[PDB]
DNA sequence: GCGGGGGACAGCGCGTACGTGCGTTTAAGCGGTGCTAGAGCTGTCTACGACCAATTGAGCGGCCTCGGCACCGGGATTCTCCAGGG
DNA sequence: CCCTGGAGAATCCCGGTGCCGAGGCCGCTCAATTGGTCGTAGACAGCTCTAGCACCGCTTAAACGCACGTACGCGCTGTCCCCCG
């Protein structure tokens, strides 16, 4: 059957950013794993702030401060600034 | 007459130990606590039970890491508290690197 | 372009970010950029890693990324090694570090 | 400011810690640690209030702050 | 209402409402509200127990957070369950450690 | 002037049931609906999970039951399930 | 077949390699059985937890998954095995 | 004959140790252990050979944590061996029980 | 701030436990074969939950009086540190 | 000067008192309950097909057990000063 998995988008990126190099089955699934990992404690930790301010619903400005409770500094800025960048991008087209 | 160095120390602990009353009195606290939060915010203003929160949380702490600083103090075969000990239990702690 | 991914210059797939995000209980209603955001954030993270990464993998003239080269990665960086620091990889190994006073004078 | 945190302070704290006796940079090396643990603490609660469109840090920012942090804290609306 | 009906002291119709509302899954059954309502009352209750005796040990008919945290620490199973949390004017338990004490 | 809920009614009658001749102050009070809702999500949090990892919709008993016994330390997990599946049976008697 | 005294597995060698990787040079004789102790208390901590998952999902067959779940749980979250 | 002299091959095995990641524990020990300790809790369980694997990666890595910190409380007490109340002092640090 | 006591720390030496090596011994790891239990995928029917509306008191804020207890000025008890004796 | 037994501080224990938050009732309202429809999540019975367990023997790397001595754990001392009163 089919298993989901970010296998793909995470062999784009690496090519981008390291085009003669190849990943293991295990280094994959860990990749896999991380990313499923930061994708719950982001998601959740602006659940919460959707809830806090009794709000129905989680938009970008959720995620956005979600992500400024989870990420170290000059991680949490540049993933800001990345961020804020591609729903601009997103609007506009 | 003279209390035998440490004497005291040994019963301040007991009063404490029986008490439940803030240590550090409230204003210097508070004024620590607006400084560091105008370096996050300016124009701020504070709810009185969210400095208490403060306190007490910070308090509560401290407490629990003397505690195991002093173990580790006496890990030591020492019985005086000292930085290094603070080092240690934090580290250990996960808190410092 | 049709995919939401390239309407955001994304390598991410925001369709499944946004599937996610719905069928996971977080709240009654999603924005429509929150996804965008999402999918961007993670992007920039496995890319800060696999960067990290490869070079680790290169520094021990290998070809193929294996997840010790991801534990190199993780705790060399101060702040990766933060957002990871009770995280644990199979096969990762530890960083080569013995204490001064183990060594001979 | 910082140095309001007394001595005498965080004596008592040491003792309701179970400690005997303290030497004299433990003070300032407990007012790094104190610093430390409220900016953590207030950056979080910030980021609450900034989240809230607020100019008044509640009790809430801090008490979701100690949670967040794993220290959570009880008497103040858990 | 349904506390009734159930025995339980613990609105078991609030209960019902928040596990619908704060965004736990899609649908919510009938026994959960009810089952929970009762964990919550049945801890609820050893707390109670245990720091009244407390405040009876240290002699008033009125219960203070000392009362708690004194209840808690004390309790072995308790203390685990709150292991992460600090307890507003709760203090500490007495404890002096051995090498620390005269000779 | 904003109608705040809580669980302090609640608590006091359940403080009756054990300890009769005895009451409560505020501040303790508050420690107590403090330690509620943070059982409360603890439990509620670790259903939602459970019943996402087994691929399901619905939170029910069984699924709290089970949080419960991820939640507590074995002796109170034990008393908590009984009270649990107690209410609940007695629930399902009246209607 | 019934199955006894099986943390005497851990033999001292291995006990020895983990606290190598571990930066300790010396070792005291009776750190062997205190680890015993130890891994025992945290075996018997995710196991409890992997099962009570595995009785949940209803099945005779432990997974790779009860067992991640349990150590996220723990706190002691885990990548590599799905997740 | 030839003789290292004691610490010299202690030194030389942290080192290799620390360059790998394969396991350390031997396998079927491990297994051993883990399916006793499960029927403890309840009989007639079965585990995906992954699932063992699982719990092994995540018990070295415990392990060898511990021994980082224990080993910093060998040092804190000016020694260089480590010993029970070491590891003793790191769990009750740690706030493990 | 003052004054002096005891704890930190450094030096040394004793006693021994733990690292090292070798020969002996045990069982891990390998891959190869065989068996069925149980997971996972499938397919039908229906019970149980969500959702809507209309009626009803449980629960909250606002209210006052009252008593558990935080306060005090007097006396009752258990520690400790000084001085006396060898 | 060290060791023993003595002395006086420091804090429980009490009786009067006193004040403000407990704990109680007043009454309004909004969240809960009731009666009811609709459809779907998941229960359950059927079926297949993975991988988990079992069992064996050829091979040998690892583990065990003992011998030896080296260098570290720790116990002692002795001084100087950093904390407590
Ligand atoms: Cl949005
Ligand atoms: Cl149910």
Do not use: W
Not at chain 3, 49 to 78: C, F, M, S, W, Y
């Amino acid at each position: 059957t089919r298993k989901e998995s970010y296998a793909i988008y995470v062999y784009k990126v690496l090519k981008q950013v390291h085009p003669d190099t190849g990943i293991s089955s295990k280094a994959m699934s860990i990749m896999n794993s991380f990313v499923n990992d930061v994708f719950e404690r982001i998601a959740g930790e602006a659940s919460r702030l959707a809830h806090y301010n009794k709000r129905s619903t989680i938009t970008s400005r959720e995620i956005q401060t979600a992500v400024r409770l989870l990420l170290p500094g000059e991680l949490a800025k540049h993933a800001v600034s990345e961020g804020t960048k591609a729903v601009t991008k997103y609007t506009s087209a | 007459h003279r209390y035998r160095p440490g004497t005291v120390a040994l019963r301040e602990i007991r009063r404490y130990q029986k008490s439940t009353e803030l240590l550090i009195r409230k204003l210097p606290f508070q004024r620590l606590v607006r400084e560091i939060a105008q370096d996050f915010k300016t124009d701020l203003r504070f709810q009185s039970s969210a400095v208490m929160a403060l306190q007490e949380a910070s308090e509560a702490y401290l407490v629990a890491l003397f505690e195991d600083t002093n173990l580790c103090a006496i890990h030591a075969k020492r019985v005086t508290i000292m930085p290094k000990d603070i080092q240690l239990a934090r580290r250990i702690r996960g808190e410092r690197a | 372009a049709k995919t939401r991914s390239s309407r955001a210059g994304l390598q991410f797939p925001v369709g499944r970010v946004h599937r996610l995000l719905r069928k996971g209980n977080y709240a009654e209603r999603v924005g429509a950029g929150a996804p965008v955001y999402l999918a961007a954030v993670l992007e920039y993270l496995t890319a800060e890693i696999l960067e990290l990464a490869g070079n680790a993998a290169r520094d021990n003239k290998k070809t193929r990324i294996i997840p010790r080269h991801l534990q190199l990665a993780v705790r060399n960086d101060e702040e990766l090694n933060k957002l990871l620091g009770r995280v644990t990889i199979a096969q990762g190994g530890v960083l080569p570090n013995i204490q001064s006073v183990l060594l001979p004078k | 400011n910082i140095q309001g945190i007394t001595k005498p302070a965080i004596r008592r704290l040491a003792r309701r810690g179970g400690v005997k006796r303290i030497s004299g940079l433990i003070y300032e090396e407990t007012r790094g640690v104190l610093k430390v643990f409220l900016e953590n603490v207030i950056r979080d609660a910030v980021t609450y209030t900034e989240h809230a469109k607020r100019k008044t840090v509640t009790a809430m920012d801090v008490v979701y702050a100690l949670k967040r942090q794993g220290r959570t804290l009880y008497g103040f609306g858990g």
